[PDB]
């Protein structure tokens, strides 16, 4: 029995016939689950069946999350979000905090259900329509609609704020030595305190949400052999930019130098104190690269000179919420991978490397995905919003396997693109 609160009017951006995305297949293991969870939502009253008559549609999928709670339903409202107009109470009710990034640890709560109580405009509903499918198509698709707030959608967190906040209101005044950020289905909470205490105080917040308007979070499982939960914790502070840029040629050859100078060139685009010319000279004239060890200590003065420039913080970072965010991933070497984020070309705000995850779980994609995820999270905590992803993988591919490893409660925007050596110059800074 949904709350008696009045309803917020939601009419997406103009000239936007809502979504019309199709439903990729899903595994048995998923259907069943997705089914169950989807069915009792109908019971409680949350969701209502509908038929063909509804033109609109979006996709959904299971996601066996490692914890005491069942799998999770997931609805790709990505496109929906795009269509729905701008909301002030969103930005307003959901502003980004700084000190946030500055803490000893941060945790993440799946606080979706909160949305389950507040209703939803009768009309705007048709724009949430989804469809569960079947093996071998025993029967046709079976579609549902959201009546209340759907778990994951711009508009959703946008409204419930009032509620969301006041609920948290006590916790803060109760001890504001911790901070909290909301992002769609998720609650970001960080305490510079000791892990255990942090973990406990976290647990407090849980119970609180419980007693308050039955806001019920997941309960991440914890065990003895390879202790994953011990790590669930999120401690940023130890988050430096990808300081991977070097060389030390004690007898630089034609290639070595040549290669490098092709590299140094590109760097001039980010950094100012760049000088490829000095070395270009040591290279001047159709020499035999092969074996030629044209050792030149004359240019050595300007070669260790660029080093100074490469060793520090690129002065220019001028973050801008009014502009979008971006990220490139690079497959630089087996195991490890790379991220760089910005809004303006060759002018990144931060960089890094998600490496191997010390597990025999060898699988290109898996990592890539994992990459974006941990990349994202990171980005969220900072400037707040979510970067677009120039994906180092071929479409058809990424598709058929990303769901199997995803684990967030949101899904960022991604696009596929080929890669040149320019950045493969280990200098991931695009």
């Amino acid at each position: 029995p949904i709350s008696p609160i009045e309803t917020v009017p939601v009419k997406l951006k103009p000239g936007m016939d809502g979504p019309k995305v199709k439903q990729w297949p899903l595994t048995e293991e998923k259907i069943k689950a997705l089914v169950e969870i989807c069915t009792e939502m109908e019971k409680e009253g949350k969701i209502s069946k509908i038929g063909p008559e509804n033109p609109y549609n979006t996709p959904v999928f299971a996601i066996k999350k490692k914890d005491s709670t069942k799998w999770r339903k997931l609805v790709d409202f990505r496109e929906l979000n795009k269509r729905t107009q701008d909301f002030w109470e969103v930005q307003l009710g959901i502003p980004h905090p700084a000190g946030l990034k500055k803490k000893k640890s941060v945790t993440v709560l799946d606080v979706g259900d909160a949305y389950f109580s507040v209703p939803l405009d009768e009309d705007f509903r048709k724009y949430t329509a989804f469809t569960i499918p079947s093996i071998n198509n025993e029967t046709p698709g079976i579609r549902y609609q959201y009546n209340v707030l759907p778990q994951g959608w711009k508009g959703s967190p946008a409204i419930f704020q009032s509620s969301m906040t006041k609920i948290l209101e006590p916790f803060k005044k109760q001890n504001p030595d911790i901070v909290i950020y909301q992002y769609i289905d998720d609650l970001y909470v960080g305490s510079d305190l000791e892990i255990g205490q942090h973990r406990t105080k976290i647990e407090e917040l849980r119970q609180h949400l419980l007693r308050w308007g039955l806001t019920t979070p997941d309960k991440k499982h914890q065990k003895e052999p390879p202790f994953l939960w011990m790590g669930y914790e999120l401690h940023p502070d130890k988050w430096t930019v990808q300081p991977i840029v070097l060389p030390e040629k004690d007898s630089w050859t034609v290639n070595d130098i040549q290669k490098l100078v092709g590299k140094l060139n590109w760097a001039s685009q980010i950094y100012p104190g760049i000088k490829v010319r000095q070395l270009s000279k040591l290279l001047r004239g159709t020499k035999a690269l092969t074996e030629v060890i044209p050792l030149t200590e004359e240019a050595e003065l300007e070669l260790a000179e660029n080093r100074e420039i490469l060793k520090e913080p690129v002065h220019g970072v001028y973050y801008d919420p009014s502009k979008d965010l971006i990220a490139e991933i690079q497959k630089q070497g087996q195991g490890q991978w790379t991220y760089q984020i910005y809004q303006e070309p060759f002018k990144n705000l931060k960089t890094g490397k998600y490496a191997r995850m010390r597990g025999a779980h060898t699988n290109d994609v898996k990592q890539l995905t994992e990459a974006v995820q941990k990349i994202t999270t990171e980005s969220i905590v900072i400037w707040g919003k979510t970067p677009k992803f120039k994906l180092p993988i071929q479409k058809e591919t990424w598709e058929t396997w990303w769901t199997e490893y995803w684990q967030a409660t949101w899904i960022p925007e991604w696009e596929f693109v080929n890669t040149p050596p320019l950045v493969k110059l280990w200098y991931q800074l695009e």
Partner: antibody, heavy 123, light 108 residues
Framework: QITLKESGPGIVQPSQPFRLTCTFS??????????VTWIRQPSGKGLEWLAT???????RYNPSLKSRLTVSKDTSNNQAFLNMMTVETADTAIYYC???????????????WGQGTSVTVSS | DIQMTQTTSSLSASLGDRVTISCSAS??????LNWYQQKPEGTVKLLIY???SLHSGVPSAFSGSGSGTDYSLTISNLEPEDFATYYC?????????FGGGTKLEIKR
């Protein structure tokens, strides 16, 4: 530093039950990676694991004992216990209680113990 | 429920001798072992976890190594406190199992 002493009967007629109590002084049985373990060292034999009481209340007993084995822990007063029923000779030994704790993502040991407790079975 | 084994039940070395002890499991355990030393006065202390991470407090003289299903405990030079039964412990498959410790008697 944290420590703990165990206590019980020392002597118990066969086919009966007994209750051993381990009183610790350092950690609490309410912290994420804490726990208390029970071990039994027989006449000359080595180290056998009876069981381990965990903070979140997830207890794991020995497959060969659970049946006639049961644990508990008055959390509030830093006291966990071991209960063994219909105790037959063999069971007669020096039981110990150790603070087990999950150090990190890859570590969990019995950081601290405490001179066991004799328990003899005999008519 | 792993099968833990300490082959060389007991040995007799002398002061300063470097000694090595062979611990064997019944399957890959992945550095999931521990080394305790029981003192003849009954006491039982923790030396090393994770098969090689030294327990804050144990003399450097002690060193961890091993892998797969075969692991090793060793000390550099002997000093009369060490002549004890040393136990090997796994924390993989919950039926945690201690192999039959190794006595470390003096040679005369």
């Amino acid at each position: 530093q944290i420590t703990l002493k165990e206590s019980g009967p020392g002597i118990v007629q066969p086919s009966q039950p007994f209750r051993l109590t381990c009183t610790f002084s350092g950690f609490s049985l309410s912290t994420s990676g804490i726990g208390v373990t029970w071990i039994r060292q027989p006449s000359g034999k080595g180290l056998e694991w009876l069981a381990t009481i965990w903070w979140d209340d997830d207890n794991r007993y020995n497959p060969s004992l659970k049946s006639r084995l049961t644990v508990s822990k008055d959390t509030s007063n830093n006291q966990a216990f071991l209960n063994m029923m219909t105790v037959e000779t063999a069971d007669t030994a020096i039981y110990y209680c150790a603070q087990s704790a999950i150090t990190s993502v890859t570590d969990s040991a019995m950081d601290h113990w405490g001179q066991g407790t004799s328990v003899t079975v005999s008519s | 429920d792993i099968q833990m084994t300490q082959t060389t039940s007991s040995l007799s070395a002398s002061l300063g001798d470097r000694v090595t002890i062979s611990c064997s499991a019944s399957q890959d355990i992945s550095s999931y072992l521990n080394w305790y030393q029981q003192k003849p006065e009954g006491t039982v202390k923790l030396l090393i976890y994770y098969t090689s991470s030294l327990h804050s407090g144990v003399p450097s003289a002690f060193s961890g190594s091993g892998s797969g299903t075969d692991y090793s405990l060793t000390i550099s030079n002997l000093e009369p406190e060490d002549f004890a039964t040393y136990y090997c412990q796994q924390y993989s498959k919950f039926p945690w199992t201690f192999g039959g410790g190794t006595k470390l008697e003096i040679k005369r």
